[PDB]
Design a protein around this motif. Structure first.
Motif, PDB file in Angstrom:
ATOM      1  N   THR A  39       4.330  14.068  -1.022  1.00 20.08           N
ATOM      2  CA  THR A  39       4.910  12.848  -1.651  1.00 20.08           C
ATOM      3  C   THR A  39       4.266  11.557  -1.111  1.00 20.08           C
ATOM      4  O   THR A  39       4.459  10.468  -1.707  1.00 20.08           O
ATOM      5  CB  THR A  39       6.421  12.836  -1.439  1.00 20.08           C
ATOM      6  N   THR A  40       3.496  11.652  -0.036  1.00 18.13           N
ATOM      7  CA  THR A  40       2.966  10.466   0.675  1.00 18.13           C
ATOM      8  C   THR A  40       4.174   9.619   1.043  1.00 18.13           C
ATOM      9  O   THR A  40       4.106   8.386   0.869  1.00 18.13           O
ATOM     10  CB  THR A  40       1.919   9.686  -0.146  1.00 18.13           C
ATOM     11  N   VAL A  41       5.234  10.228   1.550  1.00 16.65           N
ATOM     12  CA  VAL A  41       6.332   9.408   2.112  1.00 16.65           C
ATOM     13  C   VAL A  41       5.913   9.008   3.538  1.00 16.65           C
ATOM     14  O   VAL A  41       5.486   7.832   3.678  1.00 16.65           O
ATOM     15  CB  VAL A  41       7.683  10.104   1.933  1.00 16.65           C
ATOM     16  N   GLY A  42       5.872   9.930   4.508  1.00 14.38           N
ATOM     17  CA  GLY A  42       5.339   9.667   5.869  1.00 14.38           C
ATOM     18  C   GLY A  42       6.372   9.120   6.861  1.00 14.38           C
ATOM     19  O   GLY A  42       5.993   8.363   7.806  1.00 14.38           O
ATOM     20  N   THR A  80      -4.505   8.229   2.382  1.00 18.41           N
ATOM     21  CA  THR A  80      -3.485   9.009   1.626  1.00 18.41           C
ATOM     22  C   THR A  80      -2.192   8.204   1.400  1.00 18.41           C
ATOM     23  O   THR A  80      -1.337   8.615   0.575  1.00 18.41           O
ATOM     24  CB  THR A  80      -3.196  10.314   2.362  1.00 18.41           C
ATOM     25  N   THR A  81      -2.041   7.072   2.074  1.00 23.41           N
ATOM     26  CA  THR A  81      -0.775   6.304   2.073  1.00 23.41           C
ATOM     27  C   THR A  81       0.305   7.269   2.538  1.00 23.41           C
ATOM     28  O   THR A  81       1.394   7.274   1.930  1.00 23.41           O
ATOM     29  CB  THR A  81      -0.455   5.665   0.706  1.00 23.41           C
ATOM     30  N   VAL A  82       0.046   8.044   3.580  1.00 23.80           N
ATOM     31  CA  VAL A  82       1.147   8.830   4.180  1.00 23.80           C
ATOM     32  C   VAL A  82       1.923   7.883   5.112  1.00 23.80           C
ATOM     33  O   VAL A  82       3.010   7.435   4.663  1.00 23.80           O
ATOM     34  CB  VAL A  82       0.625  10.143   4.770  1.00 23.80           C
ATOM     35  N   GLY A  83       1.367   7.463   6.256  1.00 24.11           N
ATOM     36  CA  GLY A  83       1.978   6.437   7.139  1.00 24.11           C
ATOM     37  C   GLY A  83       2.953   6.995   8.181  1.00 24.11           C
ATOM     38  O   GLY A  83       3.914   6.273   8.588  1.00 24.11           O
ATOM     39  N   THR A 113       9.668   4.603  -3.404  1.00 25.37           N
ATOM     40  CA  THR A 113       8.395   3.839  -3.277  1.00 25.37           C
ATOM     41  C   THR A 113       7.318   4.630  -2.511  1.00 25.37           C
ATOM     42  O   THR A 113       6.124   4.240  -2.532  1.00 25.37           O
ATOM     43  CB  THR A 113       8.672   2.499  -2.603  1.00 25.37           C
ATOM     44  N   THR A 114       7.695   5.729  -1.871  1.00 24.17           N
ATOM     45  CA  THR A 114       6.794   6.475  -0.963  1.00 24.17           C
ATOM     46  C   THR A 114       6.319   5.472   0.077  1.00 24.17           C
ATOM     47  O   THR A 114       5.112   5.474   0.391  1.00 24.17           O
ATOM     48  CB  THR A 114       5.628   7.166  -1.700  1.00 24.17           C
ATOM     49  N   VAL A 115       7.213   4.658   0.615  1.00 20.93           N
ATOM     50  CA  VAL A 115       6.820   3.827   1.776  1.00 20.93           C
ATOM     51  C   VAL A 115       6.920   4.720   3.026  1.00 20.93           C
ATOM     52  O   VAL A 115       5.832   5.168   3.473  1.00 20.93           O
ATOM     53  CB  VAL A 115       7.581   2.499   1.783  1.00 20.93           C
ATOM     54  N   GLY A 116       8.119   5.099   3.483  1.00 26.15           N
ATOM     55  CA  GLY A 116       8.306   6.076   4.587  1.00 26.15           C
ATOM     56  C   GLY A 116       8.313   5.457   5.989  1.00 26.15           C
ATOM     57  O   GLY A 116       7.913   6.143   6.978  1.00 26.15           O
ATOM     58  N   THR A 133       0.832  -1.236   0.000  1.00 28.38           N
ATOM     59  CA  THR A 133       0.000   0.000   0.000  1.00 28.38           C
ATOM     60  C   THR A 133       0.860   1.277   0.000  1.00 28.38           C
ATOM     61  O   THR A 133       0.328   2.388  -0.250  1.00 28.38           O
ATOM     62  CB  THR A 133      -0.944  -0.024   1.198  1.00 28.38           C
ATOM     63  N   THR A 134       2.158   1.150   0.238  1.00 29.03           N
ATOM     64  CA  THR A 134       3.053   2.313   0.435  1.00 29.03           C
ATOM     65  C   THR A 134       2.450   3.122   1.572  1.00 29.03           C
ATOM     66  O   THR A 134       2.400   4.363   1.453  1.00 29.03           O
ATOM     67  CB  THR A 134       3.255   3.146  -0.847  1.00 29.03           C
ATOM     68  N   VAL A 135       2.024   2.474   2.645  1.00 31.46           N
ATOM     69  CA  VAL A 135       1.634   3.249   3.845  1.00 31.46           C
ATOM     70  C   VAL A 135       2.930   3.595   4.600  1.00 31.46           C
ATOM     71  O   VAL A 135       3.356   4.771   4.458  1.00 31.46           O
ATOM     72  CB  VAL A 135       0.523   2.538   4.620  1.00 31.46           C
ATOM     73  N   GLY A 136       3.615   2.633   5.231  1.00 34.27           N
ATOM     74  CA  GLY A 136       4.945   2.846   5.857  1.00 34.27           C
ATOM     75  C   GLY A 136       4.894   3.331   7.309  1.00 34.27           C
ATOM     76  O   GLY A 136       5.835   4.053   7.761  1.00 34.27           O
TER      77      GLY A 136
HETATM   78  K   LIG Z   1       3.680   6.348   2.224  1.00 40.34           K
END
Ligand SMILES: [K+]
Ligand SMILES: [K+]
Lengths: 194, 208, 91, 91, 91, 91, 208, 194, 208, 194, 194, 208
Positions: free
Chosen positions: F47-50, E47-50, D47-50, C47-50
């Motif tokens: 960027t939805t990095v987070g 938003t897949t921020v995380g 990947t915008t995982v974070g 999901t690229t949440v992280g």
């Molecule tokens: K993310």
């Protein structure tokens, strides 16, 4: 590494009473601790997972609390519950166990059935003279001395004690007295318990 | 679904031994078998895991690269035991863990003893004898893990097969016991003393 | 087509989760060492949440991770268009 | 075309990873100061995982980061469509 | 069409937020146990921020989460195209 | 068109960064209380990095955040297609 | 792939000195050279790093902006040494680190000594002498890091070239030693005492 | 800054024994600690990375454990292993080293070969009279006095001791006695060791 | 929007009791009712919550699976109370919490007492009597939570209805009091002593 | 679990003064602590949320500070503010309360109105002789003895004290003296307070 | 709240020496601490940001280290550097300052120029008799007594001391002796310093 | 770009006062002005900030909702000061901070004194007098923050205008001083004593 610290090592709690067993993880481990009963001589048996009950585990058995304090609790201690109780992390590699907590069951003061045994002729030929003295189904744990012809025997006295019965929660003992057959031949009149 | 554990008895310091955990049950693709130890009068100690699938085996610092864990044909995993110290004197349970992180099933476990001292065979000497009467047998000067049943396992009641005492001489002298109502002497009473480590079968009779 | 996307993904998740716990046990203090928790990991990546509660510390672990991202993102990008169309074509 | 996307990306990852460890050493307590760990960083961004295990504390560091996002996202957005089509056109 | 996307999403957010606090209370140390904070959670997922300040520790919780991602991502992917077109078609 | 996307975005980033530090000062222990650090925040969101190093604790803060996501994601989704086409049309 | 380190001997407090680390090996684009120090009887101390590539050089608080690290033509990095304190009296190893965060290779390292006291030259006085017999030489009243080989490096066995003792006078008097079977006196025995910091070559003969 | 705390500073462990060396990081540093042997006078040499062995490093050499406790371990201490052993963080900028742990090798009590040396005529002209006294390949470290004409010399006695042999793990010493030539001319009869 | 709490008085150790919290106000879909306890002279203790909506009820370790919380028709939630210990002797407030995490409204709360001792009924004995004069009544040898108003609630001023003292005998003897200007004796003064747990209504008159 | 630690248990602060009440959370809990006034016998009433004021709560009432130190503060202590004050976490499941802080109001030294009461004839028939002795609207809390015919009565003296008035902040007391009617019949002359 | 703890409060470091000033943050604050010189009576002046130098701030001035230990350092203490030095967090709301560190400059033992002053006629009419006694440009800080007609005056002695010169790092003092004009009229012969 | 601070002197406990910080420099849209305090012989204390732009003003617990900070027309921010305690006796610097989190510029700062005691006016009494000779002036029995220059600010050298001593009577008696070469008495020497809080201008002459 992750350091499960059970509490207390020993319990002498009377039957049907509220027994509780604590296990402090060195760091927060989630809910990733599992409880285990291990009866004398037998294999660990799993009582709780994620402090969630297992099929067949009795209802007395429950395990809760978080932070770092996990608490397995016996709603009504039972005779079949004299065991040692273990604690197991999962959260971090590798898996660790807690020290372990022995439960002993408290009951009404009994007395011993006593059964002194002279040495096997077959064993007397051997050259040594092993005198046994049985003490049966007593409570508590605690004094058996020997005197041949009424002088006090500190030589080759070897007490053993048993694993408490899983119904009686009682204690049997076998004091051995080992002798040179030729010291056992010098005098034979015989374990006055206390 | 139970776990069956072969091998292990006595070894020389620095010597070897291989322990055995045969599956015998509905056993998934993706199960780790583990190896837990218990010293005499001591806790459990996690030592090793393995997935028989990709055959990758992880070990304790305690055990470092002294031991090896081996994997699917015989649905068995094994505990190769090099460079043995006195400490490794202990019982060794295997156990299944389904990747969930707790031990659902547990092998009976064996005893590995580690001493420069040599094996012995037990003497076995009857103790014969109102109410209930007691009869027993000494099982004397052994080394190393001794079995005792009465009437090939039939009688089991009021029966107090004691712990192994370490003889001042250096030898596991035990004392088996049995309580019986006096009326029975009439009855067969024969205490069957088994050993893996000295190939024994001794059975002793108890008249008064 | 879409059940293909879902499945492939579900495979990727179960694949990673398996491999990561495999890839991660052995390392002192590894968090990512039970499939159950390796699964939540494996979702939260694709999901690229992280969130960050979980992750691999080992190399082989992060190699697993990369694949899980690379196949898991795409394959989740499939089911995300899939339900984007099914809302569009209707209303 | 797609090997172009992959490569460009792999360049971006190796570029950032290089620059970030460069950009980050000198700062007391900087975490992001070895290419090996700067690489896991550089992936987990594109990947915008974070996850958050790693990141830059320095300005120049985050400037690197921005580029790594900006070129790394797009260039990863390329390989993500690429394998989205190769599943589509087939089934 | 787009008000549909927004709404559906707003439903998904309020749905998850409700279910997560429901799904999460009972667990000692659960963070995600007030709708207000369950809402910030629910956004930051879709938003897949995380960020990671918040998340579920319970299974049922993460099951909620998955849905929230799966329906919340798509439904946020709708409003994200929606305002991407409204900038495009104009300029 | 694309300089529009970039700009709008850069506006959104500077807008959020301004508003968040504004929205966040006053709250004991607020981290997100200097534009400079409010900027890194504002990027890492769009960027939805987070990563999670930074975020708002206040309500008004997270309201800012939401906008920053909602306009910042879309507007970053513009520059991400923009450079996806410029690699495509060429090679 | 080894590291070759020039410069450095004695300086005045507050004075200067430049140390040298020449590549001499398959040396990648993207390697940091580092500078580690060891006081007398003291640990290692990380001081500085540099990537010769972008030529960016990071330094310890200890060393703050007292020192500079310089970078590719001669595949060398350098340790410019301003504002020297008594403390900086130490050996200075360079070392490669490939961005991985440990020191694979290590320059031989030099001694930088920091005192207001002046250089001297050693006296060098033979110690001549059954079984195995011992013969040596004093290497007296030096300042500052003294070399001693026997027969231009040929003999090396039973040879006990001692540590530098600080003479009560303020001067590194040493004592070199050699064990030899008695049969050899017949054999050439000449103890070659070198100094960078006083341009010495003294070689002394040992008849009884 | 990051504070690697090795343990113990000194070891006197007998050869072939199990030697172990601890290094507590002030905070969790990952697996980002590297071990280093540094022989007297020579450069650090890298034994372990990410507590992962290096090509050519012997098999005795292993390094494990996590949390904050890193542990380099000598399976069978060897004579060539008298060194000081260092510990190195990587996790945070900048890199830090541990204090360092000296290993000394224990062996069977030896004695010294002793070789008293009168002063170089060339040196006697100089004006001072430097008397040396060699003590060879002994164990342990520890008493050499002087007496000219049998009265006890506390003046200008200067003991030096060597770096233990990298095979013998033995100790040599050079006691110097420095004198005014004119005090050395007054009496010359001569280092009775203990 | 207020909370109305029925049930609860005295129970036997190990016995049961069910407490009641009726809505009576604009009450949203998605509200938790909670149960807080106060021992005698003791803090608040959170025990349980429930969303009547999905009817999911969470409980304290303290209370574990001893108690049950039940939920919408009568807009009421309930506190089923099994396996009662002496400790659970306490007052039990319900409270609304709108998912925000604090208690906006609070039921009046009841007293649950837990003893093997039996109920009693109060004696009630007048205390009759210048300036302001004082008149009162003893309310003697009760068990367990006693009410006292003057003139069916009308007079309330200078009125000191004391706490319940535990009689040495084991019985809640109280003493109600009232201050009045002397001119009034002319005036009706009758102290109305109510009990749920002994179905009492005693009203005593106060002439001098 | 999360451990709110209020400070101090008791306050005796004079009216109109600056009163302050501290509550240390065991870990950071955000701003997720809520304050509560609970008057003797009555239900908790909520004063502060997220240390944000409630409709109807007076302006004296404010609650701030972070880290782990939450601080409810009475700008000008009032007579209606004799209560116990509670502290409530929200951040982690489950909710916990602080110990609680009692406030008592300080005022000018008063004296008691005293009103000794002989036993109800109806009660005298009963067999016991309960003598009461009222003490009204005093400050501070603190000595009432009994003597029948001037010998000192330690028997069946049972003092009760009231909840301070929510305007006067005053204290009333009822000392009871219980007697056998037949010991009360032996002598009747009568509570000399101090 | 965030607790900057400077070290040490006072310094008496000789000129041109290495001066250093420590400031421990209660938690990690990033690099978000800023240094400030504040000369007696004047406004704080900013020396360091993000322990990064400011335009016009001298080169003696540098500020480094992390974890929780920030360290402003004077490479060569100067006479113009007698000030108090402050420490300022930015990382968390709100901003906090450190306690503060006073620097005093050490120099060669001087002596005072002394200038006793009789009371203004205009002031003598007033009714009181204020005798002053100046002590100029001395080092160190530390004894001026009074005696009228040689009996010892403990009455109405009021010493003041100045802010050390920003070039001399010297100390001036003004002991006042206040008197009833009519006690000042009784005897006038006059501050013998030590 | 400097900061100009009006208002503030003496107030009654519980009274009011308004302080003033006028811009006077290239001043950006998005700057916070702050308010820092210094008690007598005490640290700095952050109290309040404001962005004149959106006019949102944040305050210390210390100062809670006792004080208000006001904002753009006159490019000024203000410090409204209600409910004043003895503690708030202090100097009050404003300061710009550009959102970066440190104070680039700093108002001169004023003194706010807080006492129930009343204002006074200073006596001012000349001290007149070889080498260098010293001449001064007492500035006696003041209350509250006193100015002293010599020759309307012209002479500044060897000049030791002391701190304010608290007179045993309760009044800021100072003593100004000046060192001069003896040759000058010829020269004008007149010590100009200013007060905001008592509207003074006293200038006293110094013949011997
Ligand atoms: K993310
Ligand atoms: K994160």
């Amino acid at each position: 590494d992750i350091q499960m610290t059970q509490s207390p090592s020993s319990l002498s709690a009377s039957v049907g009473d509220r027994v509780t067993i604590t296990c402090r993880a060195s760091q927060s481990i989630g809910t990733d601790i599992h409880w285990y009963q291990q009866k004398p001589g037998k294999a660990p048996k799993l009582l709780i997972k994620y402090a969630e009950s297992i099929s067949g585990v009795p209802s007395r058995f429950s395990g809760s609390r978080s932070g770092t304090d996990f608490t397995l609790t016996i709603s009504s201690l039972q005779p079949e519950d004299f065991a040692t109780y273990y604690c197991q992390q999962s959260n971090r590699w590798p898996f660790t166990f807690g020290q372990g907590t022995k439960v002993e069951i408290k009951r009404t003061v009994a007395a011993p059935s006593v059964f002194i045994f002279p040495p096997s002729d077959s064993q007397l030929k051997s050259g040594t003279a092993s005198v046994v003295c049985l003490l049966n189904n007593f409570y508590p744990r605690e004094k058996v001395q020997w005197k041949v012809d009424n002088a006090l025997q500190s030589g080759n006295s070897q007490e053993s004690v048993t694993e408490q019965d899983s119904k009686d929660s009682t204690y049997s003992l076998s004091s051995t007295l080992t002798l040179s057959k030729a010291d056992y031949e010098k005098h034979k009149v015989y374990c006055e318990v206390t | 679904v139970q776990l069956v554990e072969s091998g292990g008895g006595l070894v020389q310091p620095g010597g070897s031994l291989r322990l055995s955990c045969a599956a015998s049950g509905y056993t998934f693709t993706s199960d780790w078998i583990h190896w837990v130890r218990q010293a005499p009068g001591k806790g459990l100690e996690w030592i090793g895991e393995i997935i028989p699938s990709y055959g990758r085996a992880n070990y304790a610092d305690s055990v470092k690269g002294r031991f090896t864990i081996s994997a699917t044909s015989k649905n068995t995993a094994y505990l190769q035991m090099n460079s043995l110290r006195a400490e490794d004197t202990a019982v060794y349970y295997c156990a299944r863990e389904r990747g969930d992180g707790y031990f659902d099933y547990w092998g009976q476990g064996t005893l590995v003893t580690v001493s420069s001292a040599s094996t012995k065979g037990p003497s076995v000497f009857p103790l014969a004898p109102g109410g209930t009467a007691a009869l027993g047998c000494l099982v004397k000067d052994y080394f190393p893990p001794v079995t005792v049943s009465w009437n090939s396992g039939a009688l089991t009641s009021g029966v107090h097969t004691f712990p192994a005492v370490l003889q001042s001489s250096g030898l596991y002298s035990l004392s088996s016991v049995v309580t019986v109502p006096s009326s029975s002497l009439t009855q067969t009473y024969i205490c069957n003393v088994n050993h893996k480590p000295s190939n024994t079968k001794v059975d002793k009779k108890v008249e008064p | 087509c879409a059940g293909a996307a879902t499945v492939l993904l579900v495979i990727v998740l179960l694949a990673g989760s398996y491999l990561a716990v495999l890839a991660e046990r052995g390392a002192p203090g590894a968090q990512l060492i039970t499939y159950p928790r390796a699964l939540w990991w494996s979702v939260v990546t694709a999901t690229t949440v992280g969130y960050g509660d979980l992750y691999p510390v080992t190399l082989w672990g992060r190699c697993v991770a990369v694949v899980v991202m690379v196949a898991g993102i795409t394959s989740f990008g499939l089911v995300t268009a899939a339900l984007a169309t099914w809302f569009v074509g209707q209303c």
